[PDB]
Design a protein around this ligand. Structure first.
Ligand SMILES: Nc1ncnc2c1ncn2[C@@H]1O[C@H](COP(=O)(O)OP(=O)(O)OP(=O)(O)O)[C@@H](O)[C@H]1O
Ligand SMILES: Nc1ncnc2c1ncn2[C@@H]1O[C@H](COP(=O)(O)OP(=O)(O)O)[C@@H](O)[C@H]1O
Lengths: 412, 62, 59, 434
């Protein structure tokens, strides 16, 4: 039976939890598309004690017009396909986050910040995100990095130079990232235009067509439960669906999702039987052709990037296949990935598949551990004055960050 | 220029209304199905859910 | 790719042998039991088209 | 399961390590003095030194002559060729009588060869030929255990082309033979069309590449026959093979000479080894005087196998002489070239043991009171007749709902199926009616 989600927690703090040693403790801000995750670096403690503000990245303002609201509670959100592209709907998302974390007082946030961004970020987008940050909030110095690569940095066996493929899958994108000597080989990195949002959207539209008698009973927040709790990824889809074909297996494995009641009441207050549907929603990232979409999918793409290298460095970078982010949470994901990988390697060769320690939070914990180390490496950060000579389309090439290129944007 | 390439292989053909493998497609509704009971089922659907299923696959349906 | 034709449907017998259309599904996985004399294995193996000697007697 | 048959209970000579016989062992009973002699023959065949030496088993019907001859084939085992033939096989309509003797003498000598069987199989990922004309062709293969690349010669490429192979097909290559087999299209492409004439198979779940050590057996006769007439060369695909019907033919002496000379080359190079085997000419008294005379030459030849003969005749006329009698139906001239082993009639207690060994081989339970009755009936008739009644008796026991033969079952069967002796008594009485 379905549950309902929680809302409106009580995060309130003093003006700044400044510890011993250096006073400018940075904010660690994972600016996610599904949800934002934000908090103080809190140095000198091994386990990250409190990743506060776990909240959905969505805002309310309706037919009333005169007000808007920002916490977990018609709706809007600041992103287009995992790049932020909104003005004040970004501000009132930052404002919520700062106010609930506490801030000093004066006409700026006194603390430096580390902020996640898109695997590639359009130059205009980076420029705007820098302007909307330095101008309005007055931050002293800033760092941009990629969610996935922070999660890798967290999960590495050692704080040392590495190579691998990162497999990442968030709200509206999945990416395959080849990395060599700690550097993202962004020349031949690739992404797929699908993700967990689109899975839920498909599972919704399926069950709407299965039970037209009660369109209103099924809605995204209930699709979330069946997709998180009750769905799994096949080892081989055309074989799973084949064992699902016989009634004696079906009845033993179909999921009985009881709606809340007011004929045994199921003619409207149905038990929403999900069978094959609990496979067809996860599978979208491996076979986007279950939707209309003609793209290679996470299987053909991995082969298509992996055959663009010399045969020795393939055998190097496949030694660390890493799973992180959103959709990798499905049960069975490691097994499907390592089976699909076994067919596309030399007959006796070796590979290894690692799953992130906490697939959803390790991006933030990574950004924490990174900033807490690189406090004083002033070649890594963008300082407030640099933004006055370099127009905002500028970045500092540390590991776990997008590849910079010399370029400039006309503005007046 | 980071977009993944189109797939090389031809697409598998799963049934609309159950997801099982579909040997067959109906010449009038243009949905696709696996068995006789599924062909009995589809013929009893209204136009709205028929175009509704086709729209999941960006088929001719607009 | 072999086609076998069994006549024409009764409803288009007008405008040749006639029959009612089949029941069940269009594509059937059938199973066929088949048997061959031990001699008939031997003769097929004798020549380029050994099976003719199974009729003509030239074995 | 395997069908039970007339000798399936005998498993060897069953001698002890000193060479002496045991009373009852390896599915034989009795006959110590006569089957210790086969022990010496087995050592002679295992010694490999000799050629053309020969043996005659002699004695009345039903005394064990073919059982002992088959027991020898067990003690040698499948390493060594053992060619059985019946005297009456000599009278072909395609070739002279001595040619049939000479073919069968060659069949009893084997080449034993070793090689590493090596197999590649899976879906074809790519074909790429490699200047002016094709030097080699690269091919890629895939299975659910991995991928490989191979480097083919243009002869193999011609064979792939002939099989109509293209990328996405599932293929078996055998690297030794140059054998190539198409097995259908890989099912990942099964949706290329809704209807198309191909047959689609799943991607193989086995290894891309496999190795074995195998042993090839071939006789000198196989070399003779393959090399004498032009090999047809038709994998069908060539209508000229339709016109000229095969026939057997007199293999020339010259060709056997060259074959001997080439095989000697390979057993010097260590590529092959030689196994002198046995030819069992059973039913020997059915040979003609021409053939008996030709044996005086072939048994002297310093290449010939060991030959075993058997016969059941007394002092009958030699076939083809119209006149001359001789022991065992064999000419005295040849009978002075063989060592003779005599074979002796069974006492009643021996037959009881044979009957029980047949019963438990054939699968039948029999009570002691019934087995004593088949023992008695065997003394009145013959061993080969008492052993026939076991199965029909069991089948009546089964119809009457019982597991085991009892006296009234064998007694009923005895009245229902006659012996040759008692049927002959009927023919002597109703003499004028047949
Ligand atoms: N000593 C024995 N131990 C076991 N079974 C035997 C023995 N002697 C003969 N037999 C069996 O009895 C039958 C005897 O066949 P046997 O070898 O006597 O044929 P034969 O008359 O000597 O010669 P042919 O094969 O030409 O008829 C077979 O069923 C055989 O297996
Ligand atoms: N436990 C879970 N099981 C399955 N899917 C999950 C789970 N938790 C989150 N998701 C999926 O994760 C996606 C969001 O992941 P996230 O890393 O926050 O995205 P981003 O970094 O792009 O904002 C959502 O689409 C959601 O459906």
């Amino acid at each position: 039976p379905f549950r309902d989600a929680r809302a409106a927690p009580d995060p309130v703090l003093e003006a700044g939890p400044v510890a011993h040693g250096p006073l400018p403790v940075p904010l660690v801000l994972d600016n996610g598309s599904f949800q934002v995750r934000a908090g103080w670096a809190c140095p000198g403690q091994d386990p990250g004690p409190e990743p506060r503000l776990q909240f959905r990245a969505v805002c309310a303002r309706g037919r009333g017009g005169a007000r808007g609201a920002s916490g977990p509670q018609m709706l809007r959100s600041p992103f287009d396909r995992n790049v932020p592209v909104n003005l004040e709907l970004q501000e009132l998302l930052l404002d919520y986050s700062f106010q609930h974390l506490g801030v000093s007082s004066q006409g700026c946030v006194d603390h430096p910040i580390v902020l996640t961004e898109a695997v590639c970020n359009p130059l205009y987008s980076r420029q705007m995100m820098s302007e909307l940050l330095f101008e309005c909030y007055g931050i002293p110095k800033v760092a941009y990095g990629i969610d996935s690569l922070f999660s890798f940095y967290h999960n590495k066996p050692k704080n040392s130079m590495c190579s691998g493929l990162i497999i990442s899958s968030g709200y509206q994108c999945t990416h395959v990232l080849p990395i060599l000597e700690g550097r993202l080989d962004a020349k031949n990195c690739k992404r797929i235009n699908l993700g967990g949002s689109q899975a839920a959207g498909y599972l919704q539209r399926l069950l709407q067509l299965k039970y037209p008698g009660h369109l209103a009973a099924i809605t995204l927040s209930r699709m979330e439960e069946i997709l998180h709790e009750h769905s799994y990824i096949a080892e081989d889809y055309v074989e799973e669906l084949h064992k699902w074909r016989c009634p004696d297996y079906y009845e033993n494995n179909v999921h009985k999702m009881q709606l809340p009641f007011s004929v045994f009441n199921l003619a409207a207050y149905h038990q929403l039987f999900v069978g094959t549907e609990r496979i067809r929603a996860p599978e979208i990232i491996f076979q986007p052709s279950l939707i209309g979409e003609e793209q290679a999918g996470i299987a053909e793409t991995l082969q298509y990037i992996l055959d663009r290298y010399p045969k020795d460095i393939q055998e190097m970078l496949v030694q660390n296949v890493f799973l992180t982010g959103g959709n990798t949470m499905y049960p069975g994901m490691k097994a499907r990935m390592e089976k699909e990988l076994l067919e596309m390697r030399p007959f006796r060769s070796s590979f290894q598949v690692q799953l992130a320690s906490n697939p959803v939070l390790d991006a933030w914990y990574g950004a924490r551990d990174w900033a807490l180390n690189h406090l004083d490496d002033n070649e890594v950060w963008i300082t407030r004055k640099e933004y006055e000579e370099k127009g905002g389309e500028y970045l500092k090439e540390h590991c776990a960050s997008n590849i910079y290129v010399p370029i400039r944007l006309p503005k007046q | 220029s980071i977009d993944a390439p189109p797939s090389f292989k031809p697409a598998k053909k799963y049934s609309d209304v159950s997801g099982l493998l579909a040997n067959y497609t109906d010449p009038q509704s243009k949905l696709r199905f696996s068995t006789i009971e599924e062909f009995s089922y589809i013929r009893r659907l209204p136009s709205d859910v028929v175009t509704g299923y086709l729209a999941l696959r960006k088929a001719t349906s607009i | 790719g072999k086609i076998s034709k069994l006549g024409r449907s009764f409803t288009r017998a007008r405008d040749t042998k006639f029959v009612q259309c089949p029941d069940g599904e269009l594509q059937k996985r059938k199973e066929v039991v088949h048997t061959v004399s031990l001699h008939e294995i031997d003769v097929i193996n004798s020549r380029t088209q050994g099976f003719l000697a199974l009729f003509s007697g030239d074995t | 399961t395997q069908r039970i048959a007339s000798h399936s209970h005998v498993k060897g000579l069953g001698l002890d390590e000193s060479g002496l016989a045991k009373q009852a062992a390896s599915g034989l009973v009795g006959q110590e003095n006569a089957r210790e002699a086969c022990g010496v023959i087995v050592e002679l065949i295992k010694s490999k030194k000799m050629a053309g030496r020969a043996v005659l088993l002699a004695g009345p019907p039903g005394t064990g002559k073919t059982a002992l001859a088959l027991a020898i084939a067990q003690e040698l085992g499948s390493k060594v060729p053992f060619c059985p033939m019946v005297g009456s096989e000599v009278y072909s309509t395609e070739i002279k009588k001595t040619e049939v003797l000479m073919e069968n003498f060659r069949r009893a000598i084997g080449l034993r060869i070793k090689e590493t069987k090596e197999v590649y199989e899976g879906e074809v990922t790519e074909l790429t030929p490699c200047g002016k004309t094709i030097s080699h062709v690269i091919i890629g293969l895939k299975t659910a255990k991995g991928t490989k690349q191979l480097k083919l010669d243009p002869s193999i490429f011609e064979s792939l082309q002939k099989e109509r192979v293209e990328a996405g097909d599932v293929i078996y290559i055998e690297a030794n033979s140059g054998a190539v087999k198409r097995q259908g299209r890989c099912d990942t492409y099964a949706t290329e069309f809704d209807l198309e004439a191909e047959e689609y198979v799943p991607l193989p779940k086995g290894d891309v590449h496999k190795k074995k050590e195998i042993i090839q057996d071939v006789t000198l006769h196989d070399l003779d026959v393959a090399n004498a007439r032009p090999q047809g060369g038709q994998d069908i695909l060539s209508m000229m093979g339709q016109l000229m019907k095969p026939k057997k033919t007199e293999i020339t002496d010259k060709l056997r000479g060259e074959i001997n000379k080439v095989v000697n080359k390979y057993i010097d190079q260590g590529i092959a080894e030689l196994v002198p085997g046995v030819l069992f000419v059973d039913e020997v008294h059915m040979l003609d005087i021409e053939c008996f005379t030709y044996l005086h030459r072939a048994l002297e030849s310093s290449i010939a196998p060991i030959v075993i003969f058997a016969s059941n005749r007394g002092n009958c006329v030699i076939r083809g002489t119209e006149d001359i009698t001789s022991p065992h139906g064999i000419p005295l001239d040849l009978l002075d070239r063989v060592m003779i082993i005599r074979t002796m009639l069974y006492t009643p207690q021996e037959m009881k043991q044979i009957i029980k060994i047949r019963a438990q081989t054939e699968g039948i339970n029999i009570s002691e009171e019934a087995l004593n009755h088949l023992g008695e009936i065997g003394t009145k008739t013959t061993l080969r007749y008492s052993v026939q009644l076991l199965t029909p008796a069991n089948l009546l026991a089964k119809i009457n709902g019982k597991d085991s033969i009892e006296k009234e079952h064998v007694e009923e069967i005895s009245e229902l199926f006659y012996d040759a002796k008692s049927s002959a008594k009927i023919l002597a009485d109703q003499q004028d009616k047949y």
